[model samples]
Target: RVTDEDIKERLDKIGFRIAVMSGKGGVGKSTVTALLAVHYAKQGKKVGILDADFLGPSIPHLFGLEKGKVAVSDEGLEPVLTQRLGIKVMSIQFLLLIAGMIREFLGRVAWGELDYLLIDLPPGTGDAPLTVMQDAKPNGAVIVSTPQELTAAVVEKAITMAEQTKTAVLGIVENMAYFECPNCGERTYLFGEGKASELARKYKIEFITEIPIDSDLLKLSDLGRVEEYEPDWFEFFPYLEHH
Candidate 1:
């Protein structure tokens, strides 16, 4: 379905190829990916999100692009550029067992120049993610999970996948790790803690930060306006400062 060589060449101009993965759904993986894209895009960086989570395709819903489709010019397929932030996105809301689909996407998209490309891989330790891991050649993988050892256990499989693929395990985003009192500005660790920390320590990966259950964040995300929300968690990440 695709030439093996062109996959890398297609995305060669991209600076950072980051794969966002998780063990299963409900960990808010796609939401985290959207937030990261918003963060970098907010910083005046050129960002593109390859929503490889073909089945879910919530990246569009995040940015209110549900009605948008993959466009093309005299060139190849064009990534759907968001309205407010002007972030580039590629996903059909729509894969070979996924190989061909992966090739189709990576090969076809016209993400001319970008500082960061976030590949939102589908959940589970299966062909969907495995194909992207081997084919996309991400610079690193960011594992998202809740602060539960069980969730972390599932996340470890993803870690192993990234490690064996020789892609760096960038860090972990412990999503829904706590809850913030909207009125008083207080935080409560409702989901328990240290599991992500322990897992990161065991794997020797950086525990990025714990994301609390912010009402406004969820409200904005549900409204398909994640761009309007500001998250404080991703700040101070040393790797993100590279660009």
Candidate 2:
């Protein structure tokens, strides 16, 4: 069993902890996490990302990294760094197991000092999220979802779970909220208009930011060049910067 002191001893080296979760897949959950780490690193902050999505680990591939071996030393395992932004990253793919291993792996890794450590959790309220809440004791969670009614409903379950676990929910992010035409500059409701914010209001949760669908972002992601894409609308880091 993992002790609370063991978890705190490693987390103490990091200033802030944020977990990115979603009710389902294909909602750009991992993409949002990658952008957050890169964005923070762009601000000259030391950022690290733990890709806890064991089954489908795309974080290493997202940064154009091949399945290379992690460094091991007397202290512990060292996370791999992105070549472009120099952001540190570790994924469960290296461990070759599921949620149960995250607690042990997280405790044993040598993360060193970081301004922020972002955890890219797997979708839904499952063993992974539960283990992270109980063992890691994250500072807050950022729920990701589309602007569709059904997706918002599913995302609410995650919000309720976070609240039940006494975990602080930073806010709800609406991914692919809309699409702006390049030629006409007209906004198209791909999924819906404001369903995500509506759900947040219904549950009395804070509605964070809305990200529109951009072809450039998709292209960059496909090429494993997420660090090259510029995110102009991310403002949540300002409040957490002082801490």
Candidate 3:
């Protein structure tokens, strides 16, 4: 088990805390996580991103910084900063050489510090998210979901995990919530109506916002290497500012 001392030693090196979570994958949790860091950094706050999924990590690909190396200082391990945001970040890929070291490194990060720590958690109600909650004990958690009933069912479980941890529910963000056609500027609901808002209300949790589908988002993200497609994506984050 990871002790508090192990965590504090790492947290002392940086500052803020955050976690990106979902009960099911393919809801764009990583994409949202990346955006959150961008928004805060744009506001001039120091930031960090922690790719928490060990086996299926993809955060490095999102930023296209797959081959960067991690450095260390007298303070502790140095997180890689490869963007205009000057964001400090780490992942299992950064610190582990053997199975035993993996746990040790993660334990240290769980306790480490930063202006904001965005953890890209793997899906489901299993050990991954649960371990993050228990070990890192983030100040809050962001849940990603789609409108389909199956996906909503999964998101519901993720919400429960947040509550069990006594961590605040930052809110629910729905991806693929709607589709927009560039030609006509019309919006389409291909999957189903967004139920996350209603679901959040039922549970007394905050329903953050829904992010629609935009084809340009793909190229813009690839070309700019930024998280948000546009300023509108930063809307809910203003509400998230003080949190």
TM-score for each candidate, following the candidate numbering: 0.91, 0.89, 0.83
**Candidate 1 per-residue C-alpha lDDT over 8-109 given as tens digits, one digit per residue, 9 for 90 to 100:** 676777888889988788888899999888888888889989888877788888888876766568658888788999998888672116777777778877
List clash counts for every candidate, in order: 0, 0, 12
Off by over 4 Å in 2: 1-3, 95-99, 149-152, 236-238, 241-243
Q: Write the per-residue lDDT of candidate 2 for residues 74-170, one digit (tens) a residue.
A: 7588888888888988876664434446676667778888888888987776765666665556777888777764364576577666765576777
- Where model 1 places Cα greater than 4 Å from the true spot, the runs are 94-96, 149-152, 240-243
lDDT comparing candidate 2 with the true structure = 0.76
User: What is each predicted model's overall lDDT from 0 to 1?
Assistant: 0.79, 0.76, 0.67
Superposition TM-score, candidate 3 onto the true structure:
0.83
Task: At residue 109, give the lDDT of candidate 2.
Answer: 78
| TM-score top scorer | 1
Which lDDT value does model 2 have at 171?
74
In model 1, the clashing pairs are none
- Which is the winner by lDDT between candidate 2 and candidate 3? 2
